[PDB]
C-alpha cells in the first residue's frame, strides 16, 4: 500500500477462515493482558474478544477499525449479534466471559461464583419447558442461572432464573 494506519490501535489482526489472528502488538501490556486472562493465546484471539476489542477501537483488523471491524469478525466468523452485545456489556462491566458449552450461553466467574448466561432475543420464542431444563441444567453444574434478554432495539436486561420444586 502507501501508509498502514497503526496509530491508535494497541494491536492489529487479520481475519482467517476460522479465527482472528493478531499480527502486530503496539502496546505490549495490552497483549500481555489479553494473555493473562486467556483470550489471546499465541496470537489466536477468541472471536468475541476479537469483536469486542475491535468495538473499543483497540484492535485493528487490517485497515478496518472499530465497529466496522466488529461487524467484520462478527459476520465473518458467523457469530450472533446479540450474544456479542451481552458479551461486550459483560466485558465493559469487568467480567471476562467465555462460550458456555450449551447453545446460546456465556460463562463467567466472579466473587467465587460461576455465572451461566442464556442470551435470548425478542422475536425468537422459546418453550417455557426449555427455560426450565436449561436452568435446571445450569444449576446442576454449579452455575447461577442467568437470563439476558435483548429487545428488538438492542436493550439488555438481566435476570437470575432459578428452577425449584417448591417456592421458597
Amino acid at each position: 500500500k502507501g501508509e498502514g494506519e497503526v496509530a491508535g490501535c494497541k494491536a492489529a489482526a487479520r481475519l482467517g477462515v476460522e479465527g482472528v489472528f493478531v499480527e502486530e502488538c503496539f502496546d505490549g501490556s495490552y497483549c500481555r493482558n489479553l494473555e493473562r486472562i486467556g483470550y489471546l493465546r499465541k496470537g489466536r484471539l477468541e472471536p468475541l474478544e476479537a469483536a469486542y476489542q475491535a468495538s473499543r477501537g483497540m484492535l485493528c483488523m487490517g485497515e478496518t477499525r472499530g465497529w466496522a471491524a466488529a461487524v467484520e469478525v462478527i459476520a465473518g466468523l458467523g457469530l450472533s449479534l446479540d450474544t456479542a452485545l451481552v458479551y461486550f456489556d459483560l466485558r465493559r462491566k469487568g467480567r471476562k466471559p467465555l462460550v458456555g458449552v450449551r447453545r446460546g450461553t456465556l460463562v463467567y466467574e466472579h466473587g467465587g461464583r460461576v455465572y451461566e448466561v442464556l442470551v435470548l432475543s425478542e422475536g425468537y420464542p422459546l418453550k417455557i419447558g426449555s427455560l426450565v431444563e436449561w436452568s435446571r441444567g445450569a444449576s446442576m453444574d454449579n452455575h447461577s442461572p442467568i437470563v439476558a434478554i435483548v429487545d428488538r432495539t438492542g436493550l439488555i436486561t438481566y435476570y437470575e432464573a432459578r428452577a425449584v420444586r417448591s417456592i421458597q
Binding site: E122, L126, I128, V132, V147, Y158, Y159, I167
Partner: protein, 180 residues
C-alpha cells in the same frame, strides 16, 4: 375441622350461611365475599363466592359439600370434570393445589396483573405475597414476556414466579432482577 355447604351456580359455588362463609375465610382464607371487596379480616355477611378451583380443593379435602340449585348432590369428580373441562382453570388448579398443600394461602393475582397472589399467613396480615404466572411447559413465550414480568414485579417485589405444570406435576422458576 370446619364444614360448609355451597351451591354450584354458573362456574362458581356460593356459600350462603353467614357462619360458614366467615368460617372458611377465617380458617385458610378461602373465597371472596360478595358484599365486601377487601374485608377487614371478618365482618362481612357474604355470600362467600368460591372459585371452581377452590370448590375442587375443598370438596377434595372434605370441607365443602356442593350442591346444585335443585339440591341434588354434586360429587368431587363432577367438579373435577368441570375443572378439567376448562383450559385456564385446569392449569391453575394443579398449581393451586400444589401451593395450598405446601401450606401457602393462595389468593387471586388480579390486582397484581397475574394469576395468583401467594401469602404465607394471609391477605391483610402477611403484607407481602409472591406473584405467580402459570404456564404449561409446552407454552411458547417471547423472551420480552420475561421482561414484562420483571416490570410487573417492579412495584411489589422484583421476584415473581413462573409456575410450570403438565399432567399434574409442577415446577417453579424463580425470576428476579440481576446486576452482572
Amino acid at each position: 375441622p370446619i364444614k360448609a355447604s355451597g351451591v354450584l351456580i354458573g362456574d362458581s359455588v356460593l356459600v350462603t350461611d353467614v357462619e360458614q362463609a366467615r368460617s372458611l375465610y377465617s380458617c385458610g382464607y378461602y373465597g371472596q365475599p360478595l358484599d365486601v371487596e377487601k374485608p377487614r379480616g371478618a365482618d362481612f355477611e357474604g355470600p362467600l363466592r368460591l372459585s371452581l378451583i377452590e370448590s375442587l380443593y375443598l370438596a377434595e379435602k372434605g370441607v365443602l359439600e356442593v350442591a346444585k340449585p335443585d339440591g341434588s348432590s354434586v360429587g368431587v369428580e363432577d367438579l373435577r370434570t368441570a375443572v378439567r373441562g376448562n383450559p385456564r382453570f385446569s392449569m391453575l388448579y394443579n398449581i393451586y393445589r400444589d401451593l395450598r398443600e405446601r401450606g401457602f394461602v393462595v389468593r387471586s393475582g388480579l390486582k397484581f396483573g397475574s394469576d395468583f397472589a401467594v401469602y404465607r399467613l394471609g391477605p391483610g396480615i402477611d403484607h407481602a405475597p409472591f406473584i405467580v404466572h402459570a404456564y404449561s411447559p409446552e407454552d411458547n413465550i417471547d423472551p420480552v414476556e420475561i421482561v414484562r414480568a420483571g416490570r410487573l414485579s417492579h412495584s411489589v417485589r422484583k421476584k415473581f414466579v413462573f409456575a410450570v405444570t403438565r399432567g399434574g406435576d409442577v415446577s417453579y422458576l424463580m425470576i428476579d432482577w440481576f446486576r452482572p
